[PDB]
Design a protein around this nucleic acid. Structure first.
Lengths: 101, 46, 33
RNA sequence: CGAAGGUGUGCUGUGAGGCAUGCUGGAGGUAUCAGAAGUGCGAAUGCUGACAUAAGUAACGAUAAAGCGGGUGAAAAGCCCGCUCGCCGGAAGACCAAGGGUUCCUGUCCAACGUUAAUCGGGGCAGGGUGAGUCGACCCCUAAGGCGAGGCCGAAAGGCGUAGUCGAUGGGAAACAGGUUAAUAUUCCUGUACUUGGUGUUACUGCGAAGGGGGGACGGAGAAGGCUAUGUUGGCCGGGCGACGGUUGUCCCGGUUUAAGCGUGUAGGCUGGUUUUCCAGGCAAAUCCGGAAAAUCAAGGCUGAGGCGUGAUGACGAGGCACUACGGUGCUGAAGCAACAAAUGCCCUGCUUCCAGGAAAAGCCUCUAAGCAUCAGGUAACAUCAAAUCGUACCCCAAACCGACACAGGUGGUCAGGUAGAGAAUACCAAGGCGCUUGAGAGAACUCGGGUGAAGGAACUAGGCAAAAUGGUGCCGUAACUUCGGGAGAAGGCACGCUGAUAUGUAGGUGAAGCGACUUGCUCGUGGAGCUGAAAUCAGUCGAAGAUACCAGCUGGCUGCAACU
RNA sequence: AGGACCGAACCGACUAAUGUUGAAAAAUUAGCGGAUGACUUGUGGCUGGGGGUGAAAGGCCAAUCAAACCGGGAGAUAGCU
RNA sequence: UAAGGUGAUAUGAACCGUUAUAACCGGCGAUUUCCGAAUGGGGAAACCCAGUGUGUUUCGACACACUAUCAUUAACUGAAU
């Protein structure tokens, strides 16, 4: 069985978008950001425990980060820097009949 | 016309990859030289 | 109201220059053989 | 209260040079006499940076093509909307693999990038977007090959290789149809399914291998036959009655779709079946495989498209009825059949034939050994749970890949609609997608790509180079020579359109009802409705011309060389 | 039946023209040859430099080949410019 | 050692501290993902797949430890014989 500390780790944030809002209002589906190494069983247990709702099924995907470019000044001189935003995991959690936040 | 570079990731890794460099002592010497130079990318492995 | 971008993530344009030697045929050019 | 450096002026020495001070500059510089040198530049097709010239010249990258109206805007040939025009259509459409890596969708901006402008963009910035038990990877299995405990070799490094372990481009389980987003869908939703495994309950029970045997499991070519995808026409349903003569009809336009699964098991293909006894074989043993006898029935079994039923009183559906921000959203919804023609797709890993004689291993089925014995295990039914992880956006014959470029090049797989046509050639079209990111004029020489030419017709030229010409199908006819196959489409001729009749559509193809049988339905025989449909002959008829376009052999004679592909 | 015939895909490359600071560091256009085979093609693998591979041309071995490329001996040597 | 701090970018925000347990500096500890000799097997570095124990369990499962090769030594057992 999954320990409670793991469950308190795996849930990162609710994900806000019009796709997420439409999913909630159509299919009773909750979209979250989760830890990149969280399995579907872990997400199911975490939602069922920390949110006190009953979960039907979890769908997950990994989002690759984009390249972001911005400048940093280093000793009276602006230099252009480039780097990639970190990947993250998105969970589509379908609720049986409960209401969430 | 067909040009010389005809990419293929599998062939690239099997020829010049990290595990291919580590398999022989000459390839291990290639890696040591690149570490001594301070190369940001040791191999084609990505 | 619109604001100012002030980014120009393509402002610095790196410029180079390189060429290639060209084969020429000289055989009828010849005043000899 | 103005150093070095920069820039002028004056003076001065034979010269390298020196001194003074106006401006600029804003903090360093150094008499003299010695000392040390990275100590002096015009050249080295010297090296680096900057800037000229040609010159506002060549060019702006396929000759598929554009014209107007409206919109937005500072500004419109290029953006958006509309109407026309043109181009591709076995591709210039659609879907992928490889490769790429956010290029995808929305909002904003126009510096730079875009061979012009740009309000636009594969550009900048911000936000969003990739949902799987069944698709793919991972995973089980192995090929070529790689690595390789021990091992065998080798001055060292190391080489080869056994047990083994990796390695797909190959073999191993299972999902379809509708709907939906600005951007994902066999992944979400709706409906209807399926597979494998674990664990329990019940019932019946011999189970049990790194071992044996089956199976998986395999070439080329050719020829049917049976089908389907798909198409055409008719019927049906809905709509229409014509900007110019006619159009209530052998009239016009559109639609007539529906899957996995489950049930049935037929066109076809293969094979005799079932018992009993025995054993020098399958490294051991076996009830399995192989072999040998005997009896008795060949009337059994495997395999297999398609059709049919159900799935489905559901979904979809022309079009209407509404709202609207005129984007688009919402509601309802007719008919939804038949005949003919059909593949290169399926039956087919089949069948026939040939020689060059056509992977492996696992999953799977089966047999026992050691072993386990009222256990454990196996079989079936039911219940329940589990099917993780990674990929999924977008381009993908290309402006996202390989070519330094938004480059006339290269790049494997799949799908393939109509009319002509042998055809995947070719012409014109559909669905779909585009007009190729500089335009506007002019209408010189010359260059490029083409059209046509009096008379002549190879006189051209190294040479008929290039061009012109020939070109289809059927029939008649066809020499030398020959290795007897050839030569040969030798050469050379003739007939080709349309209309009517034979025959209101023929020969042929398909084939319904009706009827007869049977072993009684996915049956057989007969019958001929309906549909489709060449070719020929006779008669007529128009044009200069009937293989009318595109498409599509020039022919003959004598010789050298090499047999030939 | 066929290293059979005509001819698309596909694989080549005989002739001409254009192009030659190209649309292209070998192409385009019009013709041309093979097109069931000694064929062609995807994906992997193996052979390494006096070595490989070669239906043989000193062909090809990353736009490089009578001895690849990279680094080193190395500031080789240069009675020559 | 301290009246200032929360590294640069850095402004800001929300805060910490002012004799002494804010920050900073030094000694000693703790934690120390994954890859890499990489060592449980494999592999195209940063990934895929396990076996055996111990413990836990809400029966879904979960946590931890160990498991490379070679050399030497020891114990056990043990072919042709």
């Amino acid at each position: 069985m999954i320990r409670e500390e793991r469950l308190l780790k795996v849930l990162r944030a609710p994900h806000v978008s019009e796709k997420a809002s439409t999913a909630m209002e159509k299919s009773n589906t909750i979209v979250l950001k989760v830890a990149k190494d969280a399995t579907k069983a872990e997400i199911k247990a975490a939602v069922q425990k920390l949110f006190e709702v009953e979960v039907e099924v979890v769908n997950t995907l990994v989002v690759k980060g984009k390249v972001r470019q911005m400048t940093v000044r280093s000793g009276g001189r602006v230099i252009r820097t480039s780097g990639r935003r970190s990947d993250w995991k998105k969970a589509y959690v379908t609720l049986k009949e409960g209401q969430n936040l | 016309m067909k040009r010389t570079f005809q990419p293929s990731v599998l062939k690239r890794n099997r020829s010049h990859g990290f595990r291919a460099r580590m398999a022989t002592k000459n390839g291990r010497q290639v890696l040591a030289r690149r570490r001594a130079k301070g190369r940001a990318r040791l191999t084609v492995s990505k | 109201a619109n604001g100012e971008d002030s980014s120009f993530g393509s402002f610095t344009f790196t410029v180079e220059l390189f060429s290639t030697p060209v084969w020429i045929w000289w055989w009828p050019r010849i005043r000899g053989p």
